[PDB]
């Protein structure tokens, strides 16, 4: 035999501390992020969905930190039924982290790269497809673990030793591997594009997404690299000592509770590193329990053209594009400003192909894209004298989610005067 008795009840109390240390921030950031998304606003474009499902998962895994930790202080407290369901939640919820983290890139891939992008409607569909997916793939982690004996775990007491290898095969490169090859394959491809563009955001971009791998390396690798050498124990490549299992029974412990970090450091490696977001949040921490908040060019412009003078029923149609080469747009909008009024949104576009409307003039105004030229058109039919107002055109970024891209600004001009 080999005994471990002393090692779970040394390491019990620092596993508990920041197993609420992960309770608390992950929940809170967790729950901020869906709320900030879904408050006073919709969804705008694909990443929402995704950023919202990737929270999702996190509160699924969140939530049962609380059930973990009533497990340490009482080891019998849990029985069979829950535990293999509470294992359930575990896994599903950390494989649909993972599948919606590698989709954030590839659909940041397919769209600034190949310039091909996603509508909200498409992006729920697949959302549905991807925890489907991540419960398909979780079946053999839990059907296992569904043991109410001392420890509720493997037990691979029965199962012959080769099936939790073939299981941490599987864990290792559908959890790691894959996941690590594919956004660091996506965000090398999309850095070494925004690196060379013109956007004014070119320097961060690459460094949000530095960010992205490293986070995601410094957090899973030290837990797959002790997989890895349980694993060579168990192909007996390796001699194991009763007291080097022990050794690999608390670096599994500590280095599975870093792990656990990596839910609470999702949101400020997505949406709170955006400046829309930060501003959004900011206004719904005002209401509450927060005080009310109160280069500029040679790079890329905004030309507009189409403005002019027209009796009060004409037709107009405004015309805007990107005077650089910039791949990270994802949408472009309209605005106004009356004299003595303020900015308002007239019309807005996503590259995906949702739209966007003012209660004024929807059923009059129709505004059109185009993803290749970065160019968004605005068809003005049965214009009003109300319609007078500067219009400017107004571009928004991915990954950054900036929309400091403002035009010249054109006049529209409809109550005039006119002769019989």
């Given at each position: 035999?080999?005994?471990?008795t ?9 596993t508990?501390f ?6 608390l ?11 900030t998304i ?5 969804i705008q ?5 995704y950023?919202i ?13 609380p059930?973990?930790?009533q ?8 029985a069979?039924?829950?535990c293999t369901?509470?294992?359930a939640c ?14 954030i890139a590839?659909?940041?891939?397919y769209?600034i790269?190949?310039?091909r992008?996603r509508?909200?409607?498409?992006a729920?569909?697949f959302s ?8 398909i ?8 673990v ?5 420890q509720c775990m493997?037990?691979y007491?029965?199962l012959?030793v080769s099936y939790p ?5 599987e864990?290792?490169?559908?959890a790691?591997?894959?996941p690590?090859?594919?956004i660091?394959?996506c965000?090398?491809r999309?850095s070494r594009?925004?690196?060379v563009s013109?956007?004014?955001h070119?320097?961060?971009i690459?460094?949000?997404?530095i ?7 410094i ?18 490549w390796i001699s194991?000592?009763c007291e080097?299992?022990?050794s690999?029974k ?6 599975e509770?870093l ?15 955006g ?5 959004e949040?900011?206004?719904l ?6 005080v009310?908040?109160?280069?500029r060019?040679?790079?890329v ?11 009060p029923?004409?037709?107009?149609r405004?015309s ?12 472009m909008?309209?605005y106004?400003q ?6 308002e ?25 185009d ?8 068809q003005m039919?049965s214009?009003?004298?109300?319609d007078t ?6 571009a928004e970024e ?11 600004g ?11």
């Amino acid at each position: 035999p080999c005994v471990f008795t002393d090692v779970l009840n040394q390491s019990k109390p620092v596993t508990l501390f920041l197993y609420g240390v992960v309770f608390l921030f992950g929940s809170i950031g967790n729950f901020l992020v869906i709320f900030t998304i879904t408050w006073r606003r919709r969804i705008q474009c694909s990443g929402d969905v995704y950023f919202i499902n990737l929270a999702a998962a996190d509160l699924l895994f969140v939530c049962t930190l609380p059930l973990w930790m009533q497990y340490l202080l009482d080891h019998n407290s849990l029985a069979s039924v829950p535990c293999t369901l509470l294992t359930a939640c575990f896994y599903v919820a950390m494989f649909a982290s993972l599948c919606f983290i590698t989709e954030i890139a590839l659909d940041r891939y397919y769209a600034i790269v190949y310039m091909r992008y996603r509508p909200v409607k498409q992006a729920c569909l697949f959302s549905i497809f991807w925890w489907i997916f991540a419960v398909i793939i979780a079946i053999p982690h839990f059907m296992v673990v569904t043991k109410k004996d001392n420890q509720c775990m493997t037990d691979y007491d029965y199962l012959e030793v080769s099936y939790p290898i073939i299981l941490n095969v599987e864990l290792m490169l559908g959890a790691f591997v894959i996941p690590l090859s594919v956004i660091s394959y996506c965000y090398y491809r999309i850095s070494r594009i925004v690196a060379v563009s013109q956007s004014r955001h070119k320097g961060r971009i690459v460094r949000v997404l530095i960010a992205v791998v490293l986070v995601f390396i410094i957090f899973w690798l030290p837990y797959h690299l002790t997989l890895f050498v349980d694993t060579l124990k168990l192909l007996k490549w390796i001699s194991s000592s009763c007291e080097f299992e022990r050794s690999l029974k608390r670096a599994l412990i500590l280095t599975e509770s870093l792990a656990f970090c990596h839910c609470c450091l999702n949101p400020l490696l997505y949406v709170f590193v955006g400046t829309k977001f930060r501003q959004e949040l900011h206004c719904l921490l005002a209401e509450f329990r927060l005080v009310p908040r109160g280069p500029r060019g040679s790079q890329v412009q905004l030309v507009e053209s189409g403005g002019g003078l027209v009796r009060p029923g004409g037709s107009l149609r405004l015309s805007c594009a990107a005077s650089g080469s910039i791949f990270t747009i994802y949408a472009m909008g309209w605005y106004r400003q009356a004299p003595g009024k303020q900015r308002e949104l007239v019309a807005r576009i996503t590259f995906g192909g949702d739209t966007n409307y003012a209660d004024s003039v929807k059923g009059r105004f129709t505004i059109s894209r185009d993803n290749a030229k970065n160019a968004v058109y605005l068809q003005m039919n049965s214009l009003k004298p109300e319609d007078t107002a500067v219009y400017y055109c107004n571009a928004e970024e991915t990954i950054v989610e900036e929309a400091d891209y403002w035009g010249q600004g054109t006049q529209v001009t409809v109550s005039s005067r006119l002769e019989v």
